[PDB]
Design a protein around this ligand. Structure first.
Ligand SMILES: Nc1ccn([C@H]2CC[C@@H](COP(=O)(O)OP(=O)(O)OP(=O)(O)O)O2)c(=O)n1
Ligand SMILES: [Mg+2]
Ligand SMILES: [Mg+2]
Ligand code: NA
Length: 348
DNA sequence: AAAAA
DNA sequence: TTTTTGC
DNA sequence: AAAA
């Protein structure tokens, strides 16, 4: 009776996944295609996984898949196999593949992506111990921090830790911009209990162009002085008012145990901060809330269904030849002709 | 890999 | 068939 | 170039 859209932005996806048996398998197959640089097959498995996550019931027969989009012949074979024996032979083969195991292990290090993981694999490396102890290898500053704080960063971040970080961010930010609005974005805004990092959007209604530019530098220098800044990379803005990203920083912060309301006495935490102009705060909030799949389908829907162009800074209508303004996420959804999807419903 | 053009 | 897939 |  319910006509499920192929777009994540036209579906409500909450964290209660009734099809984790199927989506864990589809996520593994997608990840393998990402590694094999098969972008098309990767995206097809990510879309199939995304739609199953939106279902209000578990798939228990092939009849249950009728009318569900993004499930082509290959994906239906995978679902059929899992219904048969409770296992995916396809995903099991990927989990036993040497290239796949190496890519997962290597990219688990902060600062190591697809290119460096592929380089290390082709050199014959298979373990992190052999990589770290090699005397010929050269590591980026990001990778050095990734190896030094590996156990802390791989253990992830819980809600009490995220809240403790939010307090630190807000305390530091109001010191330099007292009327600044600090919003936790990412997974935690979508209601997640855990995350690999804690993300924040910072905006100020009265700050000048220079004040807006200096905030991330002032806040990180303050933490550097305290000895809390374990890693810092500030990317200056490439945002153009009339046209690429907002001023942002990728950090590793020292989170003292005493600050967490839930050994060494502290934990290394990945933190990302984004500063945007006040008038673009709704576009940035929408972009940074995610999920990744929700954002990509929002942009795809805007292009293919509305002839509009959406990004973290603006919304442009190609037919009316006008930029559309928004003071809230609700106004962006209304401009696109979409029913409002709450942040906890964007877990596509 | 799936859906559209 | 070719093109697109956040771009 | 590469990591986000
Ligand atoms: N390819 C991406 C990656 C991220 N984002 C946006 C939406 C999510 C937000 C945060 O990026 P992440 O921190 O990796 O997202 P996450 O949702 O918070 O998940 P986690 O932080 O647990 O790794 O940035 C996006 O539009 N496209
Ligand atoms: Mg995050
Ligand atoms: Mg992040
Ligand atoms: Na990494």
């Amino acid at each position: 009776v319910k006509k499920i859209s192929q777009y994540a932005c036209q579906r409500r996806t909450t964290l209660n996944n009734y099809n984790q048996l199927f989506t864990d398998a589809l996520d593994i197959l997608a990840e393998n295609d990402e590694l094999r640089e098969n972008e098309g097959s990767c995206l097809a498995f990510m879309r199939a996984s995304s739609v199953l996550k939106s279902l209000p019931f578990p798939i228990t027969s092939m009849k249950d898949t009728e009318g569900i989009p993004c499930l082509g012949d290959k994906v239906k074979s995978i679902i059929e196999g899992i219904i048969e024996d409770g296992e995916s032979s396809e995903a099991k083969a990927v989990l036993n593949d040497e290239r796949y195991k190496s890519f997962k292990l290597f990219t688990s290090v902060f600062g190591v992506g697809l290119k460096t993981a592929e380089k290390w694999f082709r050199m014959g490396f298979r373990t992190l111990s052999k990589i770290q102890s090699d005397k010929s290898l050269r590591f980026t500053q990001m990778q050095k921090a990734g190896f030094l704080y590996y156990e802390d960063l791989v253990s992830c971040v819980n809600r009490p830790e995220a809240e403790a970080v939010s307090m630190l961010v807000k305390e530091a930010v109001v010191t330099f911009l007292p009327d600044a609005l600090v919003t936790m974005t990412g997974g935690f805004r979508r209601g997640k209990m855990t995350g690999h990092d804690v993300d924040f959007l910072i905006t100020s209604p009265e700050a000048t162009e220079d004040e807006e530019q200096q905030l991330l530098h002032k806040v990180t220098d303050f933490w550097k002085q305290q000895g809390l800044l374990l890693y810092c990379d500030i990317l200056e803005s490439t945002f153009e008012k009339f046209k690429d990203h907002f001023q942002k920083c990728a950090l590793i912060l020292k989170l003292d145990h005493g600050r967490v309301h839930s050994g060494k006495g502290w934990k290394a935490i990945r933190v990302d901060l984004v500063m945007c102009p006040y008038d673009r705060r709704a576009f940035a909030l929408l972009g940074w809330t995610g999920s990744r799949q929700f954002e990509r389908d929002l942009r795809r829907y805007a292009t293919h269904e509305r002839k509009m162009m959406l990004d973290n800074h603006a919304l442009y209508d190609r037919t009316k030849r006008v930029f559309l303004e928004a003071e809230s996420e609700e106004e962006i959804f209304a401009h696109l002709g979409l029913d409002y999807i709450e942040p906890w419903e964007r877990n596509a």
